[PDB]
Amino acid sequence: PLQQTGQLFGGLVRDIRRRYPYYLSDITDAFSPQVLAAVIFIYFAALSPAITFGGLLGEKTRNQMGVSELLISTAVQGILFALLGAQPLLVVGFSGPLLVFEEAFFSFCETNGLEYIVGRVWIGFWLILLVVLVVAFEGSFLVRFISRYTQEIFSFLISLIFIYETFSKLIKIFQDHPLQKTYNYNVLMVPKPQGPLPNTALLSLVLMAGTFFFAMMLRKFKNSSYFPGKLRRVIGDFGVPISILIMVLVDFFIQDTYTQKLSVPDGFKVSNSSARGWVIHPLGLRSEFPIWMMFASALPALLVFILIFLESQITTLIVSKPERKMVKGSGFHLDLLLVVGMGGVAALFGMPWLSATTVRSVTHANALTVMGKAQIQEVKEQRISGLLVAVLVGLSILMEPILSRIPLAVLFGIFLYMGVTSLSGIQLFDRILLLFKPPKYHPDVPYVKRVKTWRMHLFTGIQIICLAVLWVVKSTPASLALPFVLILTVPLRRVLLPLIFRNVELQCLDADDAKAT
Amino acid sequence: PLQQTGQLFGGLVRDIRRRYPYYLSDITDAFSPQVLAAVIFIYFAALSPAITFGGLLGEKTRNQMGVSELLISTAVQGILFALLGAQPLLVVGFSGPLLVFEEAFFSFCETNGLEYIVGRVWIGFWLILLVVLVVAFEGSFLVRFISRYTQEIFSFLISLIFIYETFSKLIKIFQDHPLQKTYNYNVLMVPKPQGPLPNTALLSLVLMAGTFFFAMMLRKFKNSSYFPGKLRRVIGDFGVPISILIMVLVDFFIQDTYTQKLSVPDGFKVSNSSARGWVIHPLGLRSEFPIWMMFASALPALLVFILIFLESQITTLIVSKPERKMVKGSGFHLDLLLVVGMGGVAALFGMPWLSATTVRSVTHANALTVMGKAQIQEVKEQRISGLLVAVLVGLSILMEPILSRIPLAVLFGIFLYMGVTSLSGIQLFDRILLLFKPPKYHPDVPYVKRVKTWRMHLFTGIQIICLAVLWVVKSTPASLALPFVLILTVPLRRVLLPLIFRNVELQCLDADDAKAT
Amino acid sequence: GERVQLAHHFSEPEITLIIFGVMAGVIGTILLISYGIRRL
Amino acid sequence: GERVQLAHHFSEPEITLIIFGVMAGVIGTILLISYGIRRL
Ligand SMILES: *[C@@H]1O[C@H](CO[C@@H]2O[C@@H](C)[C@@H](O)[C@@H](O)[C@@H]2O)[C@@H](O[C@@H]2O[C@H](CO)[C@@H](O[C@@H]3O[C@H](CO)[C@@H](O[C@H]4O[C@H](CO)[C@@H](O)[C@H](O)[C@@H]4O)[C@H](O[C@H]4O[C@H](CO)[C@@H](O)[C@H](O)[C@@H]4O)[C@@H]3O)[C@H](O)[C@H]2NC(C)=O)[C@H](O)[C@H]1NC(C)=O
Ligand SMILES: *[C@@H]1O[C@H](CO[C@@H]2O[C@@H](C)[C@@H](O)[C@@H](O)[C@@H]2O)[C@@H](O[C@@H]2O[C@H](CO)[C@@H](O[C@@H]3O[C@H](CO)[C@@H](O[C@H]4O[C@H](CO)[C@@H](O)[C@H](O)[C@@H]4O)[C@H](O[C@H]4O[C@H](CO)[C@@H](O)[C@H](O)[C@@H]4O)[C@@H]3O)[C@H](O)[C@H]2NC(C)=O)[C@H](O)[C@H]1NC(C)=O
């Protein structure tokens, strides 16, 4: 798929001829219990980041963009991607770097006096032009130079960040409601508690620990040798929904203690009915848009395109590895075109542009993975799961009574489970674990019995330094330079690593298909 | 060690000749960090039941027998047993059936106006005569009729009771300190909370679970392939002390919340300084003891003798199984004489008579077991560990500034660890698991490969019915009849079981040394 | 939309089709130039 | 002991010595009976 045909739109056309003949199977392969369990799992895994990022978006943008706009954008883009995308297992949604750009743009528009919502409309206009030209000249073929080195580094960094934020939310709960000898028994409740409350932080930790515990116990039970196998398989597939049901039920029966719940908006209305409508005029709402910023929108559009491109294409690389047993193919040109074009169109409606999110998509692919009798047997590659997830996200406003009884702590345990299980296929994480293991224990893999142990540990430590560098850059004001610092790993792998590693260790350690050279 | 010789005290003399030559090894074999870790483990595992049972005894005896008496009796009897017993791996202390007897006697003494302490002095006096006759006539040889059937039934029931009581203690904390919207912030804390307190029950749950999780994780860390191996083994040996220290520090750094802590008596004084002194007059304290109760004390002394005999000898059978790799020998005549005679003597000092408890002894033997490269290699059979545990129990009164910072919840998680780890060597527990496991999965063991699966499950279910019957008996006021109903399982195996099972099936399922007939 | 908005010469559909047509013409321009190059 | 206690003719050591002597006597009687049986 990464071959360069030389014909205009050749990559886009080849992607359609490769995946669309499988469309009939893309519907009928979803008629399994595991596909339904994944929809409940990815429904929450896509709804909770949507709500959190929409609320934080509303707090930083003054409600120009908020929870409702993000939810509608996520639903529409996910439906259109599941119906038309060549890799339907990707989950399209909002990400942290996108939120960092939205704040950075809002702050610039406020500093210069521009309307932020109108300014985005022009970024979305420039986004469509950039992606059409890139797809026309098969610009997605440069993805072939992102080896397992950069892919594994990026995936490990994203998973570590996800785990860190999941824990930091629990620490935030503990700071908001600290353990004290005395509390005020009369504390205002609406909209959120105005003071510390007893038992809140400790119950939130228990509902997180318990969710993670049952999730992992049911995951181990699926691979276990207990019960008739078909019953064990159906119970293990519903593992995460069963754990969510158990703990939510546990919070539901303790009614004296307060726990923070999911809060969807009241209806399908803009977050700010006084600032903007559903449609944004490109020439301005309250002030005429300057003509210089219409051309100056290309640079933020270039940055947004770089962010979305790197995130989505590296996610597609990760989920479509040969070791994952994907037999249906993926489209690096069609998916990028769909994502960026839908983002540019949603910019006109005052809605966030999205990207394929690594943790969500890897969790979606893992929930559809069927394991043989330790080894991966097949993946339930279909379109119904992601489409139903997007439909449920769009309908999440209507199911407020159900979602108002689900605590965040249960979802926090689910997120910790997702972050832990997203590390399974990353060889950098296995090599990090081999650092603490005595050499005789090291497994029978090509990079152990064809590379000296200290050489392999040096290769791992060089990757660890890259991880630390990327983590430091993220925690700085210049966190939007993260795609460039990540792309700096490719010249490191191709130019500097040959200098101190011979070719055979490079073939054994950085292998696309995990082969012994 | 169970043969009958036909010579008076023949079992006792052969018991001494069997083990006493190994006395030099019984001191030098303790020079290992595993022994010290076992000392730290069994110190708490024996001290906490001592305090709890002493508090219950003082509450029910009106302080005639209390915490200090139980502590000093446990210390002295454990020291003398470690220095003289033929099986120094047994832990000698108070048990639940003994508490049930102390309450029942107190009620009879209260009903007919008999001082309770003086009757115990006469029961213990009758205890010395009974054990001398049993030892002189080699009565311990009847232990050979207690096969693996009764041993595993008793061990499984005792482990289940231990686990059930540990969870019940956590439930009581929730009942004492219920989760509730509002609390009285000004509640007297002396000497126990006089009302519900915030964050107490939840913190107790988080501490118990934390310490259980850390203990299990370090136990897995022992068998894992991580770290230098000798360093890993050291850390795995001290896993329970590390978990205890971690959770004690966690509760130490949470100052505002209240968690119940270990409380030891103020000094080495009698629990009730008005009721009695250190020495009890057999003729009476305030009123003259009647002559008829001097002779009538034999029957409660008889019941105490069956209780202690059954518990101690079944514990000796379980701990000294051939599969546990004890090469130093176990003495069924010497330990019974020592335990019962020491209890009868301690009755004269207003002190409880003890017994070889099953859970503590099994935990003590397990902590001294050295695992091979899944298979038991050897056990550190020595006299120093139990002696130091008894010495620390006796010294616990002067270690109040250390013990007052240890929460009960940490010890609750330690008790659950002990309960779940005491089920490893029980074939009844393994066969209960095989009920929920499909036959293809079943292991390559003689009772699976030479007995039909439904026959094996019928054999297990007959044992399950006995477990239900014994658990029911323990829940009625007639819970002191448990030794007799347990004894009734010996005719069941020897008479009723051959009526429905072939001799081959009984050899495979009820095997002394796990042999395929 | 909302509140009081500025009335422009072109409505939102008019201006968005204008921008779309300009973008389409531009894209055709780079495509035709690229067709011209790599052949001479 | 403690508090106010009734005074007996025998003290604690005297009474415990006499009871241990009676116990030794009955134990010896039973042992001699057992020696007499199993022999005649
Ligand atoms: C829904 O949206 C409302 C309107 O948002 C405004 O209009 C849209 C179209 C966009 O262009 C937005 O960028 C724009 O803000 C919100 O009402 C607004 O709320 C915010 C926060 O309370 C306030 O807006 C303005 O904040 C400026 C600072 O960022 C401030 O400038 C001031 O700067 C410092 C203080 O930071 C002062 O020292 C300066 O002296 C200076 O005043 C603005 O001040 C003036 O702005 C306009 C000028 O005409 C006036 O209308 C203001 O009343 C004020 O005199 C101002 O504080 C305002 O409260 C409010 N502004 C407007 C224009 O309505 C609404 O909060 C939002 N809803 C939700 C839920 O977020
Ligand atoms: C330390 O020991 C104290 C006294 O122990 C005494 O000496 C030892 C050697 C034993 O022989 C003990 O049996 C003996 O009492 C303890 O102080 C005692 O506390 C209990 C609990 O309040 C009370 O003892 C008695 O309780 C009886 C109930 O079982 C009661 O009979 C009564 O029953 C009902 C319900 O209580 C009442 O409504 C009736 O009226 C009926 O009387 C006893 O009543 C009478 O008995 C004595 C006999 O001499 C009289 O002298 C009393 O005046 C009383 O009227 C009695 O209440 C006492 O409070 C107290 N007993 C004594 C003798 O001081 C102490 O509890 C213990 N330490 C700890 C920590 O428990």
Ligand SMILES: CCCCCCCC(=O)OC[C@H](COP(=O)(O)O[C@@H]1[C@H](O)[C@H](O)[C@@H](OP(=O)(O)O)[C@H](OP(=O)(O)O)[C@H]1O)OC(=O)CCCCCCC
């Ligand atoms: C309620 C469930 C049953 C209990 C009531 C009892 C009624 C009941 O259902 O038991 C019969 C059945 C016996 O199992 P049986 O050997 O007949 O069936 C095999 C079993 O299902 C294995 O799990 C399958 O292998 P895998 O796992 O796919 O690799 C194997 O497939 P394959 O070899 O053909 O490929 C099956 O043939 O159940 C049990 O598994 C015993 C444990 C009972 C579990 C106890 C759960 C309470």
Ligand SMILES: CCCCCCCC(=O)OC[C@H](COP(=O)(O)O[C@@H]1[C@H](O)[C@H](O)[C@@H](OP(=O)(O)O)[C@H](OP(=O)(O)O)[C@H]1O)OC(=O)CCCCCCC
């Ligand atoms: C804490 C280490 C100090 C850091 C500095 C690093 C220095 C450091 O301590 O490690 C080097 C050293 C290498 O020496 P080496 O490999 O010969 O040591 C083996 C190691 O002790 C194994 O655990 C033993 O296995 P087992 O249990 O007996 O079967 C094996 O015994 P056996 O095969 O002959 O029977 C030993 O040979 O240890 C490691 O293996 C790495 C441990 C990984 C952990 C390293 C980091 C956690």
Ligand SMILES: CCCCCCCCCCCC(=O)OC[C@H](COP(=O)(O)OCC[N+](C)(C)C)OC(=O)CCCCCCCCCCC
């Ligand atoms: C599987 C689940 C993973 C387990 C992870 C547990 C982490 C617990 C989070 C607490 C950290 C924290 O933040 O503690 C500090 C907290 C809150 O901070 P503050 O500064 O007091 O708030 C003031 C900030 N204002 C300005 C907003 C008011 O203070 C406390 O009340 C201490 C209670 C901590 C108890 C820890 C629970 C048990 C942990 C051990 C479990 C084995």
Ligand SMILES: CCCCCCCCCCCC(=O)OC[C@H](COP(=O)(O)OCC[N+](C)(C)C)OC(=O)CCCCCCCCCCC
């Ligand atoms: C591995 C370590 C253990 C893990 C197992 C968890 C057990 C925790 C205890 C629950 C049972 C209990 O204690 O509930 C019983 C209590 C007592 O209620 P009461 O009406 O006051 O009692 C009546 C008796 N009176 C009259 C004396 C007062 O109920 C409650 O107050 C409700 C709150 C229970 C919170 C449950 C904690 C969440 C656990 C979920 C973790 C998966």
Ligand SMILES: CC(C)CCC[C@@H](C)[C@H]1CC[C@H]2[C@@H]3CC=C4C[C@@H](O)CC[C@]4(C)[C@H]3CC[C@]12C
């Ligand atoms: C890449 C995409 C954004 C198209 C490229 C943008 C440039 C070439 C074009 C596209 C739309 C154009 C605008 C469309 C409409 C008007 C209103 C008119 O009264 C003045 C010119 C003005 C303001 C145009 C200026 C130039 C413009 C901004």
Ligand SMILES: CC(C)CCC[C@@H](C)[C@H]1CC[C@H]2[C@@H]3CC=C4C[C@@H](O)CC[C@]4(C)[C@H]3CC[C@]12C
């Ligand atoms: C860095 C910490 C965290 C982990 C420690 C693991 C590393 C440093 C250790 C573990 C095993 C070690 C190797 C074991 C044996 C040999 C063979 C010898 O001829 C040269 C050194 C060499 C190749 C060692 C190099 C260092 C080594 C790889």
Ligand SMILES: CC(C)CCC[C@@H](C)[C@H]1CC[C@H]2[C@@H]3CC=C4C[C@@H](O)CC[C@]4(C)[C@H]3CC[C@]12C
């Ligand atoms: C097995 C042990 C308990 C011995 C059996 C008890 C019987 C046989 C013996 C042991 C000690 C005996 C007591 C010793 C001394 C006296 C004092 C005397 O003025 C009256 C009888 C009396 C009170 C005796 C009664 C019988 C007695 C209670």
Ligand SMILES: CC(C)CCC[C@@H](C)[C@H]1CC[C@H]2[C@@H]3CC=C4C[C@@H](O)CC[C@]4(C)[C@H]3CC[C@]12C
């Ligand atoms: C109580 C629950 C948990 C246990 C359920 C498992 C029991 C009922 C099942 C599981 C496997 C089954 C056995 C599997 C196969 C055979 C061989 C057949 O020729 C006779 C019956 C027999 C021997 C079955 C008897 C019933 C059995 C033992």
